[PDB]
Design a protein around this nucleic acid. Sequence first.
DNA 1: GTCCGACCACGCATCAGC
Length: 640
Amino acid sequence: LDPSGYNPAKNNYHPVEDACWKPGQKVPYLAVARTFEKIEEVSARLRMVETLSNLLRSVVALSPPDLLPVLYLSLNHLGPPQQGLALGVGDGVLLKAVAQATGRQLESVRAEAAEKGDVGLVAENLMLPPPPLTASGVFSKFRDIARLTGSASTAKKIDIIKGLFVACRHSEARFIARSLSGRLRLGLAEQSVLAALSQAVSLTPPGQEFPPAMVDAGKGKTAEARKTWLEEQGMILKQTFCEVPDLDRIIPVLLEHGLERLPEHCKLSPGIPLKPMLAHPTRGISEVLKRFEEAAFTCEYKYDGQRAQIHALEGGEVKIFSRNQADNTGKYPDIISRIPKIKLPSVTSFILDTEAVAWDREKKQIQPFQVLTTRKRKEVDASEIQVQVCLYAFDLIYLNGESLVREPLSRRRQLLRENFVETEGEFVFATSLDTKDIEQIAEFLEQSVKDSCEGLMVKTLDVDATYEIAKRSHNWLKLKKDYLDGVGDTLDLVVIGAYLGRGKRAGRYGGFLLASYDEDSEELQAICKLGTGFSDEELEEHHQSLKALVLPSPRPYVRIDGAVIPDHWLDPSAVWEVKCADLSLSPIYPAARGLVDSDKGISLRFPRFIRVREDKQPEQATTSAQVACLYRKQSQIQNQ
DNA sequence: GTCCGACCACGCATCAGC
């Protein structure tokens, strides 16, 4: 009846009764918006999952076809990752449509949303009432916005955004703007959406003619029996979605065959991307041999490049996907021509887990990550390429029809070495080492950096050595040089500027501008920005103490060049200790400019805050000459 | 430990404005 009072967070929620739309009718967007309200209101994940599941239950029973747009709207996605659909809507475009729709000045709303940290609050705060917004239609308008390209397309995107804002009632304007800005801020993402959908199709099975005979399949169960039944049902959907992270493929099959029979039809196959195996960072060599004590592990290098899933289809078709299931086949014409040189004549199909690293041919050495990012993406010709790549395969998932996900790593490494041939500077296995004692491990870790690598990989060989990422999504372990305490390029830099925070950091500063001391010019040269490493209490100690140091104008001895203008200029007085992974040749920052490259400065890779240095003063800080020394001291730069 | 969302540098790709 009235969707304004729709409460999906009600005890003993009845899917057909407590809903707010008649069967056969389309799901109104206000129902999705009121549920977002009930989800952001709480902080318990088990509470959000149940609230979202209460909507999904009403969807599969009243409007089954609207299930896919509801899931995508909840995920704030536009489709499968390999589709490549992107909104192309910046903040300035969204703020332009907000002030245009509500009749306000651009400078009034641009300064507004900056102080709030959330555009949804500005949009919500004359014309005849338009028809209510539908969930599927709103999702179809998001795709319509993303498909617009070419000249005058930005203008065309603004009319569509304006059309939704003039039709938004109650709370819909808050969440439309949040979705269009890519910051839904629900505390609910892919893992909770999957659990809420697995719970909905189990409690209210789909494919059930009105009247729904089973609205709560957990009625005749003990409390322990229901939590166990919903958990095993959830892992069926989680593992299937891990081999096919595609909702456009799973939901139609799930609607017709149920959750239990879903693996029998949604199976891992070449050409369909799969979610890659991730690695968990660990402190030192002791935490490695502790969590992995009762299991023999291998130790492979960690290469600084781009992860590349090489799918080989029956018939020669080759597709390369990225870590986020994005199509990168047009990125590597140079690879698709070198496929036969890596597989034996008996290999008819495979899925390889490799890492693309920029390779120099004349020097026969590895190039830094910046050189790899200079490749042209898009759809290059093999003649116009310039930055060469060398594959470092470290896993095998699919081979000649059979899938290798349920096999230990020791088995996959055997088939990978037997059915594939190495090529120096083209295809070579990740340098591995099966070792248990700490002496060779610490020596192998230093050998990786000497051979221009980030660190070492730790993976079990038998015990929990499967590729089922649904059980342990971070079963692998990272061991970089910057993780070990007492080692790593630590710098004592000065804060000069600070940026207003957004979302979780709204009302505070979310970032800070850091500078190094150029003694020759007697200037403070901005080196990087810093927005991670602080504790929430430490960020308040910084938000208050630095608030007495705000300057209306930058000091004359400050030099930031093409860096982002800080929202607040600060009196240089605070010296902070900052840990970083690497030193990069910056095209934007002026720190140590001219000391290494004639046209570029130096910035920090992965900078994070460590500790305030109250004893040190701005003059007693890391010099630009010191910064230039650390750059040439780096291994990847020394090997060049 | 899991999950989520704050934030970092860099460089190709795109488009409003000229």
